[PDB]
Amino acid sequence: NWTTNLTQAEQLAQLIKEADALVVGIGAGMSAADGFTYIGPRFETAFPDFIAKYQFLDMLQASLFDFEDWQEYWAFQSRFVALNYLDQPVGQSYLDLKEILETKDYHIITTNADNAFWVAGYDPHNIFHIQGEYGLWQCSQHCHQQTYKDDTVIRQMIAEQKNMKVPGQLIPHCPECEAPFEINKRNEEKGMVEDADFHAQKARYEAFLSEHKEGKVLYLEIGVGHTTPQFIKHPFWKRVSENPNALFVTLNHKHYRIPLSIRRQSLELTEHIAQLISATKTIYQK
């Protein structure tokens, strides 16, 4: 029953059913599993200019690169936003997970910044985008705590750029301090602009955690790696340690070693996320 000869999907379906509540942590693996990849042909097709000039290995690296000027920054990012936010289609695993979660008390924290939850029709009140969203902008000097958006300008930038540069007059500027806008993204050194909406999401997430300090709480970690373990992986480990009745279930095709404190409360499921979620949904629905 509630315990870490069944298939991975059978084991997952049963735990979800049995859980009092689910705390679901989603990282880049879930998007990669639906084909929203950041290395290979998807990246090569979309950015052959930038790859030819900078020898970028992957789209994450390129999205973090300190470009020479804001004209180049916005040429790259406008296209990046269109690929992963304006025009990214619905992923089947986001739809399959949503159906499973419909019958459960749950909350989601995600380090992903793509459109995946929105095109899959999730209630925004149930999701905490701790790393911001590609569709949003912030003052590059973080001069005040407000995010902005303007998809029309993004499309202008895609249309008007040439030679990896947006025309200067199209670069958007913070109305308070006139610094250029940048993507709402968390820097290690400078942090992230966290506006009223961000704090509302955080408070909802913290509320849910406060309500589920006890009981059969399933901490379900999907496609979370080592890139930024401080947001999901490590906090989950700690929650599971602090509640002896919690379980830690990680959906990941690579092995990340689990702390000694929670070895007996942990389960690693290595099946390809898309396949696993699909098979789990099928079982869970019978």
Ligand SMILES: Nc1ncnc2c1ncn2[C@@H]1O[C@H](COP(=O)(O)OP(=O)(O)OC[C@H]2O[C@@H](O)[C@H](O)[C@@H]2O)[C@@H](O)[C@H]1O
């Ligand atoms: N099909 C799959 N099935 C199962 N696991 C998978 C699959 N595809 C990828 N994974 C796993 O998903 C994980 C992705 O890890 P990272 O690339 O570290 O992604 P993430 O944990 O989300 O960290 C990314 C960090 O950088 C920022 O872009 C982002 O905002 C976040 O803070 C890896 O452990 C990988 O093994």
Ligand SMILES: [Zn+2]
């Ligand atoms: Zn400003």
